[PDB]
């Protein structure tokens, strides 16, 4: 209570230095922590593939797509597409899709993570918890916290890494060392399986006891909670949308003084990407073995009391870890820094969403754009996004069995792959047109909604109570649909655009990867030695990542 109050007082009074901090904060945030711990408890190590593939995606971003964003001169994605394609229609629809994705993932998961952290600590149920978090974020933003966020990000990531290392040290000690994780985890099961409710009936051993292959990263391809054939490619697509299209990420990456400095920052970010496995997934399953009945229950009657949802609330593992396993005095430091990072991320998402909407939608709708009225529109947009995100919380807590990170991956894999296909085809093949790309992308969006809307209306339930969803619609994994949508939306944009030769070469000078360097005028559609050592460092870091992958795989 003292440490948390002092930390909040310091933060409010205040309101590869920024690059690494921003990259890690987006990579490993508060909602990211809680979701990673939860799915680590429910499923096992396998969720580590998410981080270990996002690492490779960050490396690919830094090595390939940052120079493309730099030579062209477009800091953001939508203006790069504006110069590449032309026409406010495609940029408008892409901004609409970005707004929807922000609402569906960023804000919703941030608020729900705050609710999970507060719910297993001082406070109340989800509604009061998110109301208090809204108050905290508002008082943060009013006092210009975002302005000093650039300086505070490095301090926050340093203290988060320090605290997470302390939690690493404490967790295996509370279990008995690394031997305890390989010894005790597979026997972690609740004592309550009676299911006094007559409708539910006696639960089979499949649900409450953990999966037998909860250790290995690579699950069964067909029948499994998280297949690896889906993992490797679907994560590539989703995280390629995440890292190579986010405006904030590219703005932070390009902020480096030189290209070699950008690559060094990417390598340091990779170092910080290899650690959150041991910091999140291991302690989540440690919290599961420590607290088997509380963390992962399967009987709905007890589950509503413990969780608030009938799924099982496997995602409350990390709040319990923080508020029990930590030393009594120091737990306030975690409960303070966790919420501070969450509030900073939420404020950044709020500002980015409002700026995007103002810059594209209301700008195209009303070309007058009175400054007072425009600011009023921005404030009303913030109000609207808060209301919609809070109204979406009951769907968020379900999240296909309570795994919060599964919800993020599902939503992104439903609506990102079309944008990824459009971007990759625009960057690779010159033939794609503005009308062709838009007409493919609208079809991809319809295809994605055709599987999202019925699934979310029907439900997911749990293993005990599956929803009355058709076998073909829900038996397909929530992430294999991203692989299907990649080669459906991209096929549509490649086929529609190929109907004619829409754009000559002069409009696409130094904007298409094929013509990386032309040294010619555009058509206006509107370290010599450090490099080898940096490449060697990247080779070493990537080899270490593969070593860990093969160790657990």
């Amino acid at each position: 209570i003292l440490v948390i109050a002092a930390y909040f007082l310091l933060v409010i009074g205040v309101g590869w230095w920024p690059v690494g901090a921003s990259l890690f904060a987006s990579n490993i945030g508060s909602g990211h922590f809680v979701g990673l711990a939860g799915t680590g408890a429910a499923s096992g190590l396998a969720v580590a593939g998410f981080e270990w593939n996002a690492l490779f995606v960050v490396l690919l971003l830094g090595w390939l797509f940052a120079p493309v964003y730099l030579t062209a001169g477009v800091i953001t994605m939508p203006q790069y597409l504006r110069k590449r394609f032309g026409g406010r229609r495609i940029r408008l629809y892409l901004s609409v899709l970005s707004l929807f994705l922000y609402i569906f993932t960023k804000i919703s998961v941030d608020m729900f993570s705050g609710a999970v952290f507060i719910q297993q600590a001082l406070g109340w149920n989800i509604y009061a918890s998110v109301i208090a978090l809204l108050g905290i974020t508002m008082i943060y933003t009013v006092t210009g916290g975002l302005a000093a966020l650039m300086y505070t990000d490095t301090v926050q990531t340093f203290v988060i890494l320090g605290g997470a290392c302390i939690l690493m040290g404490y967790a295996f000690h509370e279990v008995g060392g690394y031997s305890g994780l390989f010894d005790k985890y597979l026997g972690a099961a609740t004592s309550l399986t009676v299911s006094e409710d007559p409708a539910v009936g006696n639960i089979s051993s499949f649900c409450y006891r953990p999966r037998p292959d909860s250790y290995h990263l690579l699950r069964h391809p067909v029948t499994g909670d998280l297949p690896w054939p889906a993992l490797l490619l679907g994560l590539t697509i989703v995280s390629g949308w995440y890292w190579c299209s986010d405006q904030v990420i590219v703005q932070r990456c390009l902020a480096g003084k030189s290209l070699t400095h950008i690559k060094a920052g990417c390598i340091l970010c990779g170092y910080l990407k290899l650690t959150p496995m041991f910091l999140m997934v291991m302690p989540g399953m440690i919290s599961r073995i420590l607290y088997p009945d509380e963390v992962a229950c399967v009987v709905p009657e007890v589950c509503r009391r413990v969780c608030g949802t009938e799924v099982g609330c496997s995602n409350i593992a990390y709040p319990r870890l923080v508020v029990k396993l930590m030393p009594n005095g120091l737990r306030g430091l975690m409960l303070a820094v966790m919420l501070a990072a969450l509030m900073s991320s939420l404020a950044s998402i709020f500002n980015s969403s409002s700026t995007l909407f103002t810059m594209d939608i209301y700008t195209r709708l009303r070309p007058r754009a009175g400054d007072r009225e425009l600011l009023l529109v921005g404030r009303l947009w913030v109000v609207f996004i808060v209301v919609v995100s809070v109204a979406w919380l009951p769907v968020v807590q379900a999240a296909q069995g309570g795994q919060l990170f599964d919800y993020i991956q599902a939503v992104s894999s439903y609506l990102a792959p079309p944008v990824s296909a459009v971007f990759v085809l625009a960057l690779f093949v010159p033939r794609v047109n503005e009308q062709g790309a838009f007409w493919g992308l609208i079809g991809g969006l319809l295809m994605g909604l055709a599987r999202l809307i019925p699934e979310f209306s029907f439900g997911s339930g749990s293993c005990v109570q599956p929803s009355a969803c058709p076998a073909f619609l829900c038996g397909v994994h929530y992430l294999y649909f991203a692989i299907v949508l990649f080669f459906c939306s991209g096929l549509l944009t490649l086929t529609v655009s190929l109907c004619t030769a829409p754009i000559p070469r002069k409009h696409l000078h130094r904007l298409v990867f094929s013509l990386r360097h032309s040294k010619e005028e555009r058509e206006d559609l509107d370290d010599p030695s450090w490099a080898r050592v940096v490449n060697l460092n990247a080779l070493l870091m990537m080899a270490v990542a593969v070593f860990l992958w093969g160790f657990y795989a």
Binding site: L539, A543, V546, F547, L548, W549, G550, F551, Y552, A553
Partner: peptide, 25 residues
Amino acid sequence: QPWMQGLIAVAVFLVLVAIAFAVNH
């Protein structure tokens, strides 16, 4: 033991990187 699997993974993927290194050259 997992460490032999990790060593095999490193060897295989380093061989892959070395093979791909000739593409640019």
